[model samples]
Target: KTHIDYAYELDITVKPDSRVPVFNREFATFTGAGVPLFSLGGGPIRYALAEVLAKFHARRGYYVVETPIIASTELFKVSGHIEFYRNNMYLFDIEGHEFAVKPMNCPYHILLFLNEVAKHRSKLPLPFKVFEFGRVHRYEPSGSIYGLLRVRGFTQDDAHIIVPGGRVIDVVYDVFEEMKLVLERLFKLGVSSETFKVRLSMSDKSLIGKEFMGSKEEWEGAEEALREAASRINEKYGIDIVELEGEAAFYGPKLDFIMMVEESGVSKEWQMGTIQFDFNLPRRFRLYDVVREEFGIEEVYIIHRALLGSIERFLGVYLEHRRGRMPFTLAPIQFAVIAVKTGGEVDREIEDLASSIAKGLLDKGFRVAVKGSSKTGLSSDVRHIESTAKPAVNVFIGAKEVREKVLDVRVFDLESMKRRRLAIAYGDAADAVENLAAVAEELESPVRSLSGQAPRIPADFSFML
Candidate 1:
C-alpha cells in the first residue's frame, strides 16, 4: 500500500542576503582609495590638510596670502598659461567677458611678488614667502578623477619664493629644506629626495604634431639642463638621483620626490612633491633681472616648483596614511569634556568644574570641547566621544560626582577608556575645576581622569573660596 505511483520532488534554495554582499562591495569600491593611491575623502580631508599646512607654514614664518580664484583671461594669456594650458583650464563667459579659474598659483604668485617688488624692492629676496590654500579648477578626464587623490577642483598649499636670481639654486635648496621640515612636522614624512639626474618622464607619444608650444629639441634640451642641474646638486649633496624616461609635464622636466607606503604586504608609489625650473615663460613674459648686466644690476627666474604641492591632495594622503588619527600636535580637538548633567545646583557645580578644566586646557594650547548632556550612560557618552575623530582625552561629569564636588572624568585611549579618579579640591568651585587645564602637564600619564577612587581634593569645592 505504498504511495501509489506518485513521485514528488522538493528543491529548496536559500539566498544568504545578496543585498548585504552588494552593499559591502559598493562601500569597498567607494573606499578603494583606502589602499593609498589617492583619497575618497577629498572634501573634508581637503580642509584638514589646508588647516595643517597653513599652521605648519605660518609657524615657519610664511604669511597667509589671498589670491583670486578667478582672473582675467588676459592675465593668463600674457603669462602664456592661456596658450599652453588651454586644455587643462576651466574657462567661463561672464557678461561678455572671459574669465578662467586658476589652474596653478605660480603666475598669480609672480604677479603678487612683482607688485611687492614694485612697492619695496628692498624686500627683494627678503623671504617674502606668501601662501594661499585655495581651490584650483582644471579639466580632468573622467578616468583621471579617480578619487580625492585627483580632482577637478583642488586646494593648493602654494607659495612664491621671491629671491635674488644669483641665489636661485640656494633658494631652491632652502625651499626644499623647508619642505622637508614641513612634511616631517605634518606627516611624519621623510624621503631620500635628490636632484634630477638623467631625467625621464612619461609623455603622450601622440603629442607630436599637437598644438604643443615647445619643440622636441627644446624639450630634450630642457630635460638635459634639468638633468645637469640635478646631477650637480646630487654631487654637491652626495646623493644619487637618476631620472627615468616617461612623459611628464609638457612645459619642462622636474625634480620629483617619490615615496612609498607598505600595506598588507604590498607597496604602492606616490608622487609626494616636485620642483621644476621653467625658462620658456620667463623669457616669453620678458621677466628679467634689474641688474648691472655689464654694470651689476638684477635679473629674474620664473619659479615653477611645488614644495608641498596640492595641499588638498597631500591632506588626503595624510588622512589615509594616518587612518584619520592625527598626531596630537595637529589634531583639531586635543581634548573633549562632557558635563553629563547640567541641571540644578549639582549641574551648576558640574558646569563650573568642566568649564574651569576646559578653559585651563585651552589656555595651554589644547583644543577642548564640553559636551552638553545630562545622561549617565558612559557607553552612550562614549558614542559622542568617538565622533570627535581623534580626541586625545575626554572628561565626563555626572550628578553624583557634581553634587559630591567630584567629576567622573573619563579619559579615552584612542581605542578604549582608562578610568581615573581625580580629586579636584579647590576652595572655590570655579578655581578648582579650572585647574584641570594643567592636568596634561601635571598628570604623569598620557591621560588623566578627575573622577572616583582618586585622592579627593580639599572638600571646599565651592568657587567662593
Candidate 2:
C-alpha cells in the first residue's frame, strides 16, 4: 500500500480547521492554542536525514557552532534588525530589559566571531567559516502559516564566511558550487542548466540611506561585485541568471538559487539556497581583523550563506518531490527482515536467523528492523513496511531458505511496480552487506531510479556468521 492510501485506511485526514494533511500533521504536531509551531518527531528516518546534511556540511570544512536561541534586544538593535525587522520579531521583557527570540542566526554568529576568533586572526586568517543548524523564531502572520513549509519556528543550515574584500566573489562562486553539488548528490535533484537559476537580489535603489545601510558608493560596489559573480557562475555552470532590484536584504545584495519544480499542470520555483554579502552587520558590531589591522586594514567582508535555506521547508518540498518514496540512504530504515511464522522449531530457527542478520546489518551501519507475528503474516508485514516507507530491501526468512542456508532478498524497482528478488547463501552474508552498502551510496548520486540497473553483487556468494 502507498503512504497516502495507508493514511486513508487509518482514517488520518486533514485537520478540520487548519486543513493540514494527515501525513505532515502526524509527523509534526501543532502546539499551543492551534498555533502553527511544531516539534519534529524523533523518527529514525527523518532524524537520520538531518544528520546526513550536517555531516555533509562538516565535510565541506564548516566548523559547527551552537548559538543561543534567545538574546538581548540590544543585539538585534545593533544588527539593524530592530529598525528593519521588528514586525517579524517576538520580543519580551525580562527584568526590565528586553529580550527577543532570535529571528536569524547572523547576530549570534557575528558575536561569536568577534568575541572568540577575531582576536586570533593572525593565527586563523581569512575565509573563516562557521555553521550552525540553529532554530530561529519569527512571528509570521496567521494567514501565512502552512504546515512545515511556512512555520513560525524553523531551523536553518546557516553559515558565515569572513574573507578579504577582494575575494568576496570567489567565495560566493564556491558556495554556489557547493550548493549545486549537495542538491544533485544528496537530494537526487540534479541542477542541470535548465533545472536551476540564480537571482541577483539587490537593495532597492530608492531606499538608499533610509532603509539600507552603507554609502551609495559602497552599495554600488557590492552590487557590481555580486553581478560579476553571478555572471561568472552563469558562464561556468550554464545556468539561467537574472537580477532583481529591491529583493536584497537590508544589509546587502544576495544571490539566491531557485529550483524549478513541475507539478500537475504548473511549474513553480522555490529558493533553496542563498549567498548574501553583508556590509552592515560587521560594521554595526565593530568586527575588525587584527591581522589585517596590523597591515592598516580595518574591516573584513561577511558572507551569509544557507545551503538548505530552511530544513523544515526543505523537508516539505522534498516529500512532495519524491512522493514519499525516499531513497534508501536517506530513508529512516535501510532494510527490514521478516520471519515467515511465529512459532514451531523451524519458525523459531528462522526468526533467530532474521534477528542475527538484523544485528549484523546494524553493526555495519545499516538501519534494519525485523517485523512479523502470528497476527500478521509475511505479506502483512511487508505491506506495513511499504506503507510506512520504512525499508528499501526486505529480507524474508522462510523454511525453504532456512534449510538451504540462503536468504531471499526483495527490492522495489523505482520506476515500476514490479518487485525483484535475489537469493544468496548464508556464507556470503558479509558480501551481501557490502553490496547493500554500495547500493545505498549509489542512491546518493544523481540517478533517477535503480530500475533496470545491476547493483554490485557477490559472485562467489558465501559467508559465515
TM-score winner among the candidates? 2
Q: What's the TM-score of each model vs. the native?
A: 0.62, 0.78
lDDT of 2 by residue, 154-232 (tens): 8887899887667767778778887877676556677867788888889888898878877676678778778777788
Tens digits of per-residue lDDT for model 1, 1-465: 000000000000011111235465433354332222221212223444555556656655666667888987887887775566788888899999988988777777777766766676654545456767766888877667533456677666676654444555565665556555555544455445332122345334457335333556545544554555566556655545656555566555566655565556577665666766554565555444432232143443444556657654665565555445443443444456767774466777777767776666655555566666766555676664454233445566667665665555444332222334466544454554455555544432221111111111111111110
Q: In candidate 1, which residue ranges exceed 4 Å CA deviation?
A: 1-64, 81-84, 116-123, 126-130, 141-147, 162-166, 190-242, 245-248, 289-300, 338-352, 359-367, 371-376, 379-384, 396-465
| Per-structure clash totals for the candidates | 27, 5
**Candidate number achieving the greatest lDDT relative to the actual structure:** 2
Candidate 1 global Cα RMSD = 13.9
The deviation in Å at residue 357 for candidate 2 is 1.3
lDDT of 2: 0.66
